[PDB]
Enzyme design. Structure first.
Site, PDB file in Angstrom:
ATOM      1  CB  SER A  64      -1.033   0.279   1.513  1.00 45.53           C
ATOM      2  OG  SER A  64      -1.844  -1.111   1.040  1.00 45.53           O
ATOM      3  CE  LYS A  67      -4.392   1.489  -0.729  1.00 47.11           C
ATOM      4  NZ  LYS A  67      -3.825   0.121  -0.919  1.00 47.11           N
ATOM      5  CE1 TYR A 150      -5.616   2.149   3.440  1.00 46.60           C
ATOM      6  CE2 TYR A 150      -5.552  -0.068   4.036  1.00 46.60           C
ATOM      7  CZ  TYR A 150      -4.867   1.115   3.294  1.00 46.60           C
ATOM      8  OH  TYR A 150      -3.905   0.868   2.673  1.00 46.60           O
ATOM      9  CD  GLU A 272      -2.290   6.171   7.991  1.00 44.32           C
ATOM     10  OE1 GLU A 272      -1.504   6.068   8.957  1.00 44.32           O
ATOM     11  OE2 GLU A 272      -2.750   4.951   7.451  1.00 44.32           O
ATOM     12  CE  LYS A 312      -1.081   3.763   3.350  1.00 43.10           C
ATOM     13  NZ  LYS A 312      -1.226   2.717   3.799  1.00 43.10           N
ATOM     14  CB  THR A 313       2.001   0.589   7.482  1.00 42.97           C
ATOM     15  OG1 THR A 313       0.684   0.543   7.533  1.00 42.97           O
ATOM     16  CG2 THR A 313       2.523   0.979   8.971  1.00 42.97           C
ATOM     17  N   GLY A 314       2.695  -0.348   4.346  1.00 44.37           N
ATOM     18  CA  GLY A 314       2.068  -1.135   3.317  1.00 44.37           C
ATOM     19  C   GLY A 314       2.644  -2.551   3.420  1.00 44.37           C
ATOM     20  CB  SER A 315       1.771  -5.551   3.898  1.00 39.29           C
ATOM     21  OG  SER A 315       2.017  -5.215   5.380  1.00 39.29           O
TER      22      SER A 315
END
Length: 359
Positions: A64, A67, A150, A272, A312-315
């Site tokens: 993510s 994004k 989300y 965020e 921001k986190t993403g996986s």
């Protein structure tokens, strides 16, 4: 008497290195940028079976975090006059004119407030016509604009509209326009055959090697693969928008503009945002089940924080990412792993490192 580079390396060794054994992670890259100086720390293996070490060339999936590039592309199209955030998607995807989804505006898609879009598209939604059909068959639930949930299809639809407004497929928007403008030369939506040797294996919870599979609107949702140097350059761009032409500078600023709040979290475009200094629990709350998985009433911004930070986190199935930057401290951090670790651990480790680095 200990140089700054060693001081940063020690902090990363103390806070990030233990996660490798704790979560059985094969490989990790951690980068810090401070006052335009870059520090790159690589651990473990990008491919276990190949005994190939993680390094500056290693390509990881951003999940993510992709994004953020979608949001930047949207800010670019907006400041070029190709879209307005008050437009609805049927202005660009003509087959959505006079459907329910054409009541939702672009900012509301980008910031997850349509009121009836879930975390993911349905599994059975695969082809391009199935994506159009899904949006044709969409019906409202909660009042439009009132609740944040989300949602990948929500910002995916935003990205598709952005691409239509630029008359290019979304992958080309990134690879031909946005990545070059940001000076990113090792970042991809589609990794070419001549770079596959640098594409890390991801690793599932059984430590088996995998990479991301195709999915609907995957490009604007989670489609980007990048290296640690490139991600440090992306952080540098967010820290210094004034070093880019009017269009891309304004695009980056667009992504930093808070739009609404849910408690202490400000929803910007992709990013965020939080008042700085942020407590650890503010940052953890942004990744709580309540915020990530449930719908929440949005409220207008009250405090417009002068001093702020962004993350921001993403996986993906086989990868983890975290990015964070603090403009007025001129500092940022990127973590890339080729196995998922809990979001809380990424946030905690980065908080410890960034707070201990000498000003």
């Amino acid at each position: 008497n200990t140089p700054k580079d060693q001081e940063i390396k020690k902090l990363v060794d103390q806070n990030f290195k233990p996660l490798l054994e704790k979560y059985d992670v094969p490989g990790m890259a951690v980068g810090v940028i401070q006052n335009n100086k870059k520090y790159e720390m690589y651990y473990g293996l990008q491919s276990v079976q190949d005994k190939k070490a993680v390094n500056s060339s290693t390509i990881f999936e951003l999940g993510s975090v992709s994004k953020l590039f979608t949001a930047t592309a949207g800010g670019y199209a907006k400041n070029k006059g190709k879209i307005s955030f008050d437009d609805t998607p049927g202005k660009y995807w003509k087959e959505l004119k006079n459907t329910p989804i054409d009541q939702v505006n672009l900012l509301q898609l980008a910031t997850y407030t349509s009121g009836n879009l879930a975390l993911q598209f349905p599994d059975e939604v695969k082809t391009d016509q199935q994506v159009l059909t899904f949006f044709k068959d969409w019906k409202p639930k909660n009042s439009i604009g009132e609740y944040r949930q989300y949602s990948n299809p929500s910002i995916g639809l935003f990205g598709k509209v952005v691409a239509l407004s630029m008359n290019k497929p979304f992958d080309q928007v990134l690879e031909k326009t946005i990545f070059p403008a940001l000076g990113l030369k090792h970042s991809y939506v589609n990794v070419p055959k001549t770079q596959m040797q640098n594409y890390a294996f991801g690793y599932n919870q059984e430590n088996q090697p995998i990479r991301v599979n195709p999915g609907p609107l995957d490009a604007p949702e989670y489609g980007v693969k990048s290296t640690l140097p490139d991600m440090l350059s992306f952080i540098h761009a967010n820290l210094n928008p004034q070093k880019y032409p009017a269009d891309i500078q304004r695009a980056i600023n667009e992504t930093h503009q808070g739009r609404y709040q849910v408690n202490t979290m400000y929803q910007a475009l992709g990013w965020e945002e939080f008042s700085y200094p942020a407590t650890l629990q503010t940052l953890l709350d942004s990744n709580s089940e309540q915020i990530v998985m449930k719908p929440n009433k949005v409220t207008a911004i009250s405090k417009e924080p002068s001093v702020k930070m962004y993350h921001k986190t993403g996986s993906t199935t086989g990868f983890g990412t975290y990015v964070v930057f603090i403009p007025k401290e001129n500092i940022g951090l990127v973590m890339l792993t080729n196995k998922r670790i809990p979001n809380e651990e990424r946030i905690k480790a980065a908080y410890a490192v960034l707070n201990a680095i000498k000003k």
